[PDB]
């Protein structure tokens, strides 16, 4: 597979373990602590998905015992940014776990995101963004839902996390339960800072 | 801010220092449901207090209050506030249940805007852009059928304790929601009393 | 059983169902909506306990299908006040459910209360009070932990409720997790209003 | 209010408008732990901001702040604040993690009083009347051994989001605690990093 990486230098190494759980060896973080991963497909099944942010080996909740992520050069990531660069929407039907050092995680898919029983484990702050990240000179500047009418949909089995949660999309539909420490929810066509302060809004004339 | 309906489902509404409004909710039925009907239901920064007390005491937002004389040996377990006009609701401050803790539901099919609103001493709070469904005087559930109106969460967000239900044809948001668990249901649907979805109206 | 009622007019009828779950037919509520029940023992085992606050028959979570409480004269209780009047401390090892109309529940035991895996179901507000209720002319005036050094202890399996929670005791020990919508915790020797506003405190000279 | 230790575990502390203090936490180790040591750690009504940012941005309590220059390509995932003097802590306002969200732990074996304190943008907050345990420079856990001091929650209570740990020989309280889940451990114990209890010291 449900997660297929991009072919460039921003494509992480993706593999699968045992019962279908996918393990993502995220790319090296940059000088701003951002592991910027790009995908042609980012879908999570019921077996879930594990982002390897570990410097030493250990045991993950979803995938059992895993080794360190060799793409990390002695530094864990602070923000794991997952960006779909194709036209395919994301379907999240299981848990995403940050293995190793806890970090923030962001899924960016301007084509749409569906959460039906998804969740986050060992992430300090988790964000679902139906929109694109904005870069200038390689520094992350924020996000944009401008000129976009796609949907963040929360299905019957809902979304759970013990940490912080951001839901960012032109439109949000829901028919289930959200469990999170706190939820920042922002609808409409806007631009955002990296922390999801609203900077601008696109309104019809 | 809060204007009751003229019928016998209209509660008595007064104000105390600061502008905080106090609502002596109507007598509940045997099942604990106090069904209150309003021409307007808007909460300002000074907030609003539902008097669900069988003894005098101290409310957090309005100071000392007497028992609610509409209560006859039983407090509400569900305080259902229904707007029966076409006026949308604006909630800019806290809603407090004074006395016995209870569930609070605001039902306004015209739309609800929360901007810095919240709930004190409720065991469950619900914002419903829709109507309650009654049958032989018994609350059967809620309906967002044949309704395109908006539940809007503003920049100062929504803070509550415990269970929160956001029920509306459409939900817009521009800020933070704090609750232990949020049941969010968009679209045109019917629901049970406890907001289990029972049916959905879908375009053909 | 663990729950044995007092012999007076304030003793509720207590029975047991199937796997040991105890069903309490609480006494008639008074003009202030208070069902005042007195016990020689109030202990909850793993099978839990159900307070019957129902006007029509139905199904409870812990005890299956139950009938209405005939002690209710067409009015459910608003506050279920359970008071131990003996010297025996309370051990709560399972859930307490209010069957029927949701109400507030208070357990008052000046001898001590231990919660180890206890919880509350369909209670709007739940209170554990190592102390005594104060009455004047039959109206509940509040509670007192004065001249009392006994313990509210929370054990390894903790306490859970989706509603509001008050923990009132001379001293509180804990070695577990509390899950509640909100917790008011008050230690020391004090008196309280019915809503647990502190009115006075006993301090050594 | 907040006075850092003179060693290299002492962070830089400044103040902005209103009196809000800003803490440029020390460089974390590879495991994300920023170990900060203080002669005093008290938060006033204006609150306190931990700068855990790798880019400039907007903090909620202190306005615009630059990146924390102590951070070298990795933000803290755990901000451990340790008082190494005998001064007890008084927390009368909010503690904000600005930048990357993180866990926050205040360790003060002399005692901690919370009265209107709270936490913004933390994924877990912990008050520990005790000491962290280190081994080869790695955080192994925490200890309330040989300690009789008090964690005291005052009338204005404690508000946080998500997970809260209250770890102290004794806990007194006089108000409301808001959190999704509270791990409360009294007595004299050792704990893992994640506050699993590992041993207990008991009278003979």
CB C74 within 8 A of CB C55: yes
> Which residues in chain D touch residue A55, judged by CB atoms under 8 angstroms apart?
30-31
Distance from CA of D204 to the nearest CA of A (A): 39
CB D101 within 8 A of CB A124: yes
Distance from CA of B61 to the nearest CA of D (A): 15
Smallest Cβ–Cβ distance between B176 and the set A174, A175, A184 belongs to A184
> Which residues in chain C touch residue B78, judged by CB atoms under 8 angstroms apart?
102
First to last CA, chain B: 40
Judged by a CB distance cut-off of 8 A, whether residue C33 touches chain D is no
CB A41 within 8 A of CB A86: yes
Query: Within 10 Å of residue B56's Cβ, how many Cβ atoms?
Result: 12
* Chains interfacing with D (3 or more CB pairs < 8 Å): A, B, C
- The CA-atom distances, in angstroms, between C113 and each of A6, C44, C152 are 59, 11, 5
Q: Topology of A1-205 in CATH?
A: Pectate Lyase C-like (2.160.20)
CB B88 within 8 A of CB B107: no
CB C97 within 8 A of CB C160: no
Is the Cβ pair C75, B71 closer than 8 Å?
no
Q: Residues near C7 by Cβ (< 8 Å), separated by ≥ 6?
A: none
Is the Cβ pair C178, D197 closer than 8 Å?
no
Distance CA D135, CA D146 (A): 19
DSSP-derived 3-state class of residue B190: strand
Name the DSSP class of C44: B
The residue among A27, A30, A33, A161 with the most chain D CBs within 10 A of its CB, best to mutate, is A33
- The CA-atom distances, in angstroms, between A114 and each of A42, A96, A169, C8, C171 are 11, 14, 11, 60, 48
For chain A, positions 137-166, list CB contacts with chain B under 8 A: 154
The CB-side HSE value for A190 (13 A sphere, CA atoms) comes to 23
Distance CA A35, CA A78 (A): 8
Distance CA A116, CA A137 (A): 36
Is the Cβ pair B73, C33 closer than 8 Å?
yes
Torsion of CA A161, A162, A164, A170, to 10 degrees: 20
Tokens of A53: 């942010």
Distance CA C144, CA A137 (A): 66
Distance from CA of D86 to the nearest CA of A (A): 32
Distance CA B102, CA C177 (A): 25
CB B50 within 8 A of CB B36: no
R_g (Cα) of chain A, nearest Å = 16
Distance CA D76, CA D56 (A): 16
Q: Show the CA angle centred on residue C180, arms to residues C174 and C183, nearest 5°.
A: 70
Distance CA C12, CA C27 (A): 5
Strands A159-161 and A171-179: parallel
Tokens of D139: 């955080």
Judged by a CB distance cut-off of 8 A, whether residue D204 touches chain B is no
Distance CA B129, CA B108 (A): 5
Q: Where are the domains of chain C?
A: 1-205
Q: Residues near B197 by Cβ (< 8 Å), separated by ≥ 6?
A: A175, B185, B189, B190, B191
DSSP-derived 3-state class of residue B18: helix
Is the Cβ pair B177, A182 closer than 8 Å?
yes
Method used to obtain the model: X-ray
Is the Cβ pair C187, D177 closer than 8 Å?
no
Is the Cβ pair D180, B178 closer than 8 Å?
no
Distance CA B92, CA B114 (A): 6
CB A194 within 8 A of CB A166: no
Distance from CA of D78 to the nearest CA of A (A): 9
Distance CA B121, CA D13 (A): 39
CB A190 within 8 A of CB A201: yes
Q: Residues near D110 by Cβ (< 8 Å), separated by ≥ 6?
A: D83, D85, D86, D87, D88, D89, D129, D149
Distance from CA of D94 to the nearest CA of C (A): 18
Distance CA D158, CA D155 (A): 9
Tokens of B65: 């209050």
Show the 3-state SS of chain D.
CEEECCCCCCCEEEECHHHCEEEECCCCCCCCEEEEEEEEECECCCCEEEEECCCCEEECCCEEECCCCCCCCCCCCEEEEEECCCCCEEECCEEEEEECCEEEEEECCCCEEECCEEEECEEEEEEECCEEEEECCEEEEEECCCCCCEEEECCCCEECCCEEEEECCEEEEEEEEECCEEEEECCEEEEECCCCEEEEECCC
DSSP result, B47-116: -EEEEE-SS-EEETTTEEE---TT-SS---SEEEEEE-SSPPEEE-SEEEEEES-EEEEEE-TT-EEESS
Name the DSSP class of A67: -
Cα–chain-centroid distance for residue D54?
20
DSSP result, A125-168: EEEEESSEEEEETTEEEEEE-TT---EEEE-TT-EEESSEEEEE
Distance CA D140, CA B32 (A): 53
Q: What are phi and psi of A47, to 5 degrees?
A: -60, -15
Strands D89-91 and D112-114: parallel
- The CA-atom distances, in angstroms, between C92 and each of A156, C120, C135, C152, D127 are 35, 11, 26, 11, 28
Query: Within 10 Å of residue B8's Cβ, how many Cβ atoms?
Result: 8
Q: Residues near D42 by Cβ (< 8 Å), separated by ≥ 6?
A: D1, D2, D89, D90, D91, D92
Distance from CA of B182 to the nearest CA of C (A): 12
Q: Topology of D1-204 in CATH?
A: Pectate Lyase C-like (2.160.20)
Q: Which residue of C has its CA nearest to D160?
A: C182
- The CA-atom distances, in angstroms, between C16 and each of A39, B143, C19, C57 are 59, 40, 8, 17
- The CA-atom distances, in angstroms, between A118 and each of A40, A115, A158 are 20, 5, 7
Cα–chain-centroid distance for residue A194?
14
Q: What are phi and psi of A202, to 5 degrees?
A: -100, 120
CB C115 within 8 A of CB C128: yes
* Chains interfacing with B (3 or more CB pairs < 8 Å): A, C, D
């Amino acid at each position: 597979n449900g997660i297929v990486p991009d072919a460039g230098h921003q494509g992480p190494d993706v593999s699968a373990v045992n019962g279908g759980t996918q393990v993502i060896n995220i790319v090296t973080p940059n000088n701003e602590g951002i592991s910027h991963n790009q995908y042609q497909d980012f879908n999570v099944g019921k077996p879930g998905a594990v982002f390897n942010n570990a410097l030493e080996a250990g045991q993950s909740q979803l995938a059992g015992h895993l080794n360190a992520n060799s793409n990390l050069n002695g530094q864990a990531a602070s923000l794991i940014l997952n960006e779909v660069v194709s036209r395919n929407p994301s379907f999240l039907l299981g848990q995403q776990e940050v293995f190793g050092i806890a970090a923030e995680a962001v899924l960016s898919n301007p084509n749409g995101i569906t959460c039906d029983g998804c969740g986050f484990i060992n992430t300090s702050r988790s964000s679902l963004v139906v929109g694109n990240p904005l870069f200038e000179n390689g520094q992350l500047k924020g996000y944009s839902t401008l000129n976009n009418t796609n949907l963040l949909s929360l299905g019957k089995n809902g979304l759970n996390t013990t940490g912080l949660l951001d839901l960012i999309a032109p439109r949000i539909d829901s028919r289930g339960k959200i469990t999170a420490a706190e939820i920042s929810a922002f609808t409409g066509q806007n631009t955002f800072s990296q922390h999801f302060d609203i900077l601008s809004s696109q309104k019809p004339v």
